[PDB]
Amino acid sequence: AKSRTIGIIGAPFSKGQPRGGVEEGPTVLRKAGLLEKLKEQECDVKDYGDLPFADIPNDSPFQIVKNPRSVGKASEQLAGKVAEVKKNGRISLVLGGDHSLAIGSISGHARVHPDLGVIWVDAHTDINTPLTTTSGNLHGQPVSFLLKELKGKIPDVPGFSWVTPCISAKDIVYIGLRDVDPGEHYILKTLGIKYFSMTEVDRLGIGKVMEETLSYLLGRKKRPIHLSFDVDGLDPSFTPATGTPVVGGLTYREGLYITEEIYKTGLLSGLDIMEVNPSLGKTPEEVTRTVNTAVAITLACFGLAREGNHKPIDYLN
Amino acid sequence: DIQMTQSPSSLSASVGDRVTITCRASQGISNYLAWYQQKPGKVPQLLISAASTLQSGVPSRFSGSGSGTDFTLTISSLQPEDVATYYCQKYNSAPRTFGQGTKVEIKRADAAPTVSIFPPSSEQLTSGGASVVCFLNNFYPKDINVKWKIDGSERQNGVLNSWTDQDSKDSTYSMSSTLTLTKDEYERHNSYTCEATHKTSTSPIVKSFNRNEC
Amino acid sequence: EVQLVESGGGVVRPGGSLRLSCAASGFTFDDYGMTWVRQAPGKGLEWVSGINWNGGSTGYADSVKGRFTISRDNAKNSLYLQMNSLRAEDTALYHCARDRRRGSYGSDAFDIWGQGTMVTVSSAKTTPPSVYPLAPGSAAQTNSMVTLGCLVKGYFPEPVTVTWNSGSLSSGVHTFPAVLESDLYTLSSSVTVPSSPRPSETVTCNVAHPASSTKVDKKIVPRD
Ligand SMILES: [Mn+2]
């Protein structure tokens, strides 16, 4: 179908984070059989292979932003690849990685479909600017490089000179926020970004949360959706092997429901599975659980419904 | 895996003229290649980080280049204090396998070895063995194949190799043709010969001795 | 100041086991990604394995895959490497190397290295050598320029020290690197450059085997 016509892009990149290890995100997400599982449902999966990220040996912090040139060039490469897989009419399934790659994954996707609406599922806002950041990491600042409303509040970071901010403030919906810094929250409330923090999810139920999300994005006009999932968005009992797990988050069922409701719109046009960190699993079972949850989320984005799926044939024969 | 192949397994250009080691890999590693330098008897120091990158403190002679599958390392001028063995790291996720290495050396006045042979020790003649050693010293190049003769007939299980890496001062090489025998084999024959084979001496230099003549 | 002090075994004959160590100091240990490499004496290097700032992405070379394991203790600054079922081809000098930059982000080269822990694997015990040399130098065999050399046979393990005239004579001293026997011992040699008319040459071939702490001085003076 026009949906579930996947183009998979590896992104074994971790330099946008503190001392990392998420670069073996694609390796585990694939060795857990993601392509082999996406082919049972009628998906035209094309593996564009793990991106070769050229090395930046001498790459010094900008002011506090750790290793900005590496992240900037990695995201430019990813954006080029994502534009390549979107010109083929596919769904750019960028499985990474860290959100420092979301800058590329959305900037490339917006080169083709300028009017995409982003659904950001993350425990964090990931909206620090290079000025208001505190840890000086770039996994925590991918949205600030994308919002049109933050132009002028984003310094000319080295390596991010190619970034033209693409999404408006009114084209992004946060789901699952439960760990927001004061600067992130000031930016979030000033720009009028629609967000469904954990409190709004508890108040409304995930069903009403997703109904409002889709009526807010796809209400005025049907547009592509770029679900930029982050596995720390789900509760740590389900995804323990992630960078910064925050307790009391979306359950497994709620994550699956988010993805199923996004799929059923049929407008999904890009997906990111970020922050799978198999090095932070206390036990190999924790890594297996995180990877299985990420795989289940990914599959549900592409038609695998919990009620069960059947091919359009007469099974009573 | 990924197989890394130093192109010259050993080279000797000159004090002066440039040197270019190649490290064609198996599958594209895409700008993840570190060039090392060991200077035998020490710890390998890193020279080049990502295929050029000229790590701090490394003299600007080294100008490695390339990307993708094959690379190089062009030493602009050899400057014999750079005589060492160079490696090739391929640092990405975790094959990280090095290369074979590349013996780099210089030349001097190309000379003929001084071949000399020695009988077994009489102190060993009380022990139950025989050790006839032919020492070949101060020669260039490396190539000599050494033959041992049972008064005219071939020998096996006794031809032992002992090379020396290049001297520091005169930059010369040395071989000792170690041969170890038994007492029954030693007293059967006397004229034990060691046969040189060098580019200088177009004739194989063969020397022998008589048993208990020495 | 960034010392990587290496410790651990060095003599295991059977397919036994060892556990090396690398007491790192000078840098923040739980930040860099330490590794282990081996180097058979006089041969090329080989990457043994490597780990993270944390331990958990331990990757191993496909020659020690099922045999070696790396652990790491960030609170105590060590780089344990457990070797099991040694295959006797693992007779290399094992280095611990750092990661050259901050994050243990996976792909990184090796800046600072330790040295040592010469693991040998071997069927025999640490044994004194059997220095069994002679040289008719300077006899009138075929040359007026006859060299003077020794042979050191049957010692283990590496290395040994051979000095000449109590280390005074350095001219033409070519101490050939030790060569493994077929008898699971090691064979070496060393030569000088004497001539026939050098009567004031009382050559003391001072071989020392500190592994067994044994010293054999085979005096050499030109004779009949
Ligand atoms: Mn997050």
Numbering used by the authors:
A (entry chain B): 3 to 319
B (entry chain F): 1 to 214
C (entry chain G): 1 to 224
Article, verbatim:
Using a transgenic mouse platform, mAb5 is a human antibody constructed on a mouse IgG1 D265A/kappa backbone. In contrast to all previously described mAbs, the density for the second (i.e., bottom) half of the mAb5:hArg1 complex is almost completely absent, visible only in maps in which the top portion has been masked out and at very low contour. Lacking this second hArg1 trimer, the “bottom” set of Fabs are no longer conformationally restricted through binding interactions with hArg1. Distinct from previously-described mAbs, mAb5 binds to only a single hArg1 monomer,  thereby sharing a relatively small interface with hArg1 that covers only 908 Å2. Analysis of the epitope:paratope interactions reveal that the binding of mAb5 does not sterically block the hArg1 active site which remains accessible despite mAb5 being a neutralizing antibody. The inhibition of hArg1 occurs through a different mechanism of action in which mAb5 interacts with an amino acid important to substrate binding by hArg1. In the hArg1:mAb5 structure, the loop containing Arg21 adopts an altered conformation in which residue Arg21 on hArg1 moves by ~6.1 Å. This is driven by Arg21 participating in a salt bridge with Asp30 of mAb5. The distance between the guanidino carbon atom (CZ of Arg21) and the carboxylate carbon (CG of Asp30) over the 100 ns simulation indicates that the salt bridge is realized throughout the simulation time. These results confirm that the likely mechanism of inhibition of mAb5 is through tying up Arg21, preventing it from forming the necessary interactions with both substrate and product.
